[PDB]
């Protein structure tokens, strides 16, 4: 690489969502989305393998099409009302096109097909940057239009994203695809609670981000790609196992881990708004999510898969783990349930 273009690209990656979430003009939100996409593409295609090229191409055409639909919605709103924000009396067709295009930006089902494809064939840190940072700007736009959303389309997208994410993560054995389907399921939960409480989708987004940051960090430590690769972790880094298991259980939503809190409070708000059918279906598919997490836990922690001869040399060498980032986020993402009234806002 080169430090100058590293600084330019990473600053533009930062600047995109910041402009989107701090700008009150829909045009400036759109140019923030464009900033994020165009800046993150060279970080995706960096290893210059065919898989990286394919992932960059798929991501580019998907996000470009979705952003074009977003800009269509903005221009139609400007035609209808003369302003640059959906105020209160816009067209429901415009709002539904906005929701559909932002769903394809976010990557929730049935627009979810590219997300495991792009997450596969991409290095783990770029998968982390995608699955955490790229989902804040479209969520910021969705939170900005908090009323005047179609709850029917919202709930349909939410339920199909949770269903398809649970099934996909159940099938997959590649770790990056597992993380992508986890992303799809949690985005389904956030979108489900979006029209009733912006605070709860913000809370679920924060819980998901602080939960899947150290999961990706622990994958990044040993460059573990598959279930077998994470299975020979007892020989590589045996101190990782308890935190890995606790974070996987917290992603599953088991009490008393703090990952139970977003699902619990979202179910509470949906009970307050009388959507028991959707809440029950979402909870059962979250149990399916917990099943594929628990199979991962069986592979990596509660059993000891066979190891090979060169792991002796791996034990001979020395390692390095980031301070202030892994352990802090792991503790805050596992043992922060009794601070639930402070976490909800």
């Amino acid at each position: 690489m080169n430090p100058i273009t590293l600084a330019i690209i990473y600053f533009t990656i930062f600047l995109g969502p910041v402009i989107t979430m701090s700008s009150t003009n829909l045009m400036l939100m759109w140019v923030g989305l464009e900033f994020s996409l165009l800046a993150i593409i060279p970080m995706l295609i960096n290893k210059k393998n065919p898989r990286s090229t394919e992932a960059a191409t798929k991501y580019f055409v998907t996000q470009a099409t979705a952003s074009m639909i977003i800009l269509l919605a903005i221009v139609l709103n400007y035609k209808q009302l003369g302003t640059w924000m959906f105020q209160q009396q816009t067209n429901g067709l415009i709002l539904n096109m906005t929701l559909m295009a932002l769903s394809m930006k976010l990557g929730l089902a049935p627009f979810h097909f590219w997300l495991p494809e792009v997450t596969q064939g991409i290095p783990l840190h770029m998968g982390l940057i995608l699955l955490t940072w790229q989902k804040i700007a479209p969520l910021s736009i969705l939170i900005q239009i908090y009323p005047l959303l179609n709850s029917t389309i919202i709930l349909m997208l939410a339920i199909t994203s949770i269903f398809m994410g649970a099934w996909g993560g159940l099938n997959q054995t590649q770790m990056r695809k597992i993380m992508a389907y986890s992303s799809i399921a949690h985005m389904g939960w956030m979108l489900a609670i979006l029209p009733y409480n912006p605070s709860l989708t913000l809370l679920n987004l924060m819980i998901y981000i602080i939960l899947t940051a150290p999961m990706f960090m622990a994958l990044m430590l040993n460059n573990s790609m598959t279930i077998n690769s994470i299975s020979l972790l007892w020989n590589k880094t045996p101190a990782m196992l308890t935190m890995i298991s606790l974070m996987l259980l917290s992603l599953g939503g088991l009490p008393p881990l703090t990952g139970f809190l977003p699902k619990w409070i979202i179910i509470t708000e949906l009970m307050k708004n009388n959507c028991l059918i959707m809440a029950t279906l979402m909870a059962m598919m979250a149990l399916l999510n917990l099943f594929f997490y628990t199979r991962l836990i069986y592979s990596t922690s509660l059993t000891m898969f066979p190891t090979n001869n060169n792991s002796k040399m791996m034990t001979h060498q020395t390692k390095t783990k980031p301070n202030l980032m892994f352990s802090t986020l792991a503790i805050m993402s596992t043992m922060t349930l009794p601070l639930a009234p402070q976490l909800i806002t």
């Binding site: 140019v31 464009e34 210059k48 090229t53 960059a56 055409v61 099409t65 800009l71 400007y78 494809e117």
Partner: protein
């Protein structure tokens, strides 16, 4: 003006259908993307000229700048695809399914 705006919206719809329905050519997909861009530019310019929104007249120039940036990135990715395979075929780039 409403007839012309209906025609421009239908032109955007046609270019969106072209973007969604692939025919073996990433370059043709990028062409459909830029057709969508041109339709949006004409819609925004006609709206601003009709409403006399001279303060909002920089909006088409902004969307043109960002659209050319995304077209630039797409052409660079097409160059990388052609270097990888040599044919530039969207069905040929498919190996991330497993």
């Amino acid at each position: 003006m409403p007839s012309t705006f209906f025609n421009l919206t239908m032109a955007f719809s046609l270019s969106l259908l072209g973007t969604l329905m692939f025919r073996s050519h990433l370059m043709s997909t990028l062409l459909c993307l830029e057709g969508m861009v041109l339709s949006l530019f004409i819609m925004t310019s006609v709206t601003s000229l009709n409403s006399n929104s001279m303060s909002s007249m920089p909006i088409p120039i902004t969307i043109l700048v960002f659209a050319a940036c995304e077209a630039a990135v797409g052409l660079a990715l097409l160059v990388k695809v052609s270097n990888t395979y040599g044919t530039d075929y969207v069905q040929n780039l498919n190996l991330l399914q497993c």
